[PDB]
């Protein structure tokens, strides 16, 4: 809008875009439900 006199300023609307590469390797493994020497938690997350 252009209500009052003075100095207005606008900027750009849209910019460029590009794709980011990958991760390429995140596996999930096969636990066994009847197993005993383990935790009863179904989903575990291990990082290293």
């Amino acid at each position: 809008t252009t209500t009052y006199p003075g100095v207005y300023l606008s900027e750009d609307a849209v910019s460029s875009f590009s794709v980011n590469s990958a991760a390429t390797a995140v596996p999930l493994f096969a636990y066994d439900s009847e197993n005993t020497n383990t935790i009863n938690k179904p989903i575990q997350v291990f990082r290293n």
Partner: protein, 355 residues
């Protein structure tokens, strides 16, 4: 106009102008204090150093506002403001806050050194509306835990520094790092300028971080961009990462955001003396030149990422280009200007080969 023959004297008056730069520093703090005089209760006050703070205000005994403010001066100098308020939900002066910041023309950064969450999030929502009419603000924020705060959801001007920093005092007390991280922006613009991302700068005087972060959860927190205070063995504590909140390729970096924020505020302050002049052609070439001689000086000191050609600016103000006849009648001017900023260099990749 001339009747008696005599000799008449006359000069040529013109608003011919140029643009000069100010500093991008000196914020205000909106924590709670204890003033000494009743007129210092609810008005903005300029503080020059640590000496005159001890005259107007006091250091009490139980109380973290006096500790968090002296760490600002040990890192970087410069004056600062402060706005004392007592009650978090006192929406009287909180509504009366944003119409006091505009009358002082300088304010650039925004922060709050208060520890708890109920006081800070009441502040951050009070002046969140005053960020999107493009007057030139850039606030700072802290995170209560592993994810960003939601009082300002997605904006081009925030910055989050995750792990809070402690400090010894007679059990050491914790401190939200939004106070002392404002002072480290006052050193980078001194010698290096605005267009350098503050990362390798070293925090000046601290014991240790509160929680020790490692590289395997640095990988998770460096997207959804929030920054991090790191600890190293040889050089001690250091700030790390210079990414803003919203992650399109338009503005993902602190300096590219803060370079366009400072280049606008210097040319907008000097076009204000010429705001009612006629829209003829000799005014157009005088404005287009004073903008041309501002980006050229800023180009040849290493801040616009252009090569040895001229291609860093295309400021044009003509009538055939960039305008036409029918918006002259509803008096307008259009300044199409554009830069090509420089990006910080992270992720250096070597890729040795045999030949």
């Amino acid at each position: 106009v001339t009747s008696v023959p005599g000799v008449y004297i006359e000069e040529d008056a013109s608003p011919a102008m140029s643009v000069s730069a100010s500093a991008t520093a000196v914020p205000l703090f909106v924590a709670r204090f204890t003033p000494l005089k009743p007129e210092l209760a609810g008005v903005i006050t300029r503080i020059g150093s640590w000496l005159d703070y001890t005259i107007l205000f006091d250091s009490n005994v139980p109380p973290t506002a006096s500790v968090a403010l002296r760490l600002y001066f040990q890192n970087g100098g410069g004056p600062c403001y402060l706005y004392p308020l007592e009650k978090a939900d006192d929406n009287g002066p909180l509504a009366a806050l944003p119409d006091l910041i505009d009358e002082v023309g300088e304010i650039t950064l925004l922060a709050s050194p208060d520890p708890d969450e109920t006081y800070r999030t009441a502040v951050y929502g009070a002046l969140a509306a005053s960020l999107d009419q493009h007057k030139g603000y850039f606030l700072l924020a802290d995170s209560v835990n592993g994810d960003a705060p939601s009082a300002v959801g997605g904006s081009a001007q925030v910055a989050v520094y995750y792990p809070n920093v402690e400090v010894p005092h007679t059990a050491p007390l914790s401190l939200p790092p939004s106070a002392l991280i404002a002072g480290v922006y006052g050193k980078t613009d001194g010698e290096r300028g605005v267009w350098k991302a503050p990362a390798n700068v070293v925090l000046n005087g601290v014991s240790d971080v509160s929680v020790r972060v490692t590289n395997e959860q640095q990988a998770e927190l460096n997207p959804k961009g929030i920054n991090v205070i790191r600890h190293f063995s040889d050089r001690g504590l250091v700030v790390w990462g210079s990414r803003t909140q919203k992650d399109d390729d338009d503005w993902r970096y602190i300096p590219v955001r803060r370079l366009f924020d400072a280049a606008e505020r210097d040319i907008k302050k000097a076009l204000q003396p010429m705001v009612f002049e006629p829209n003829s052609q000799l005014t157009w070439k005088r404005v287009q030149t004073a903008i041309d001689n501002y980006l050229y000086r800023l180009w040849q000191q290493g801040a616009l990422a252009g090569n040895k050609a001229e291609e860093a600016y295309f400021v044009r103000v003509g009538k055939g280009i960039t305008m036409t006849q029918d918006e002259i009648n509803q008096g307008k001017m259009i300044i199409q200007v554009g830069m090509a900023a420089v990006r910080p260099a992270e992720f250096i990749i070597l890729k040795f080969t045999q030949d």
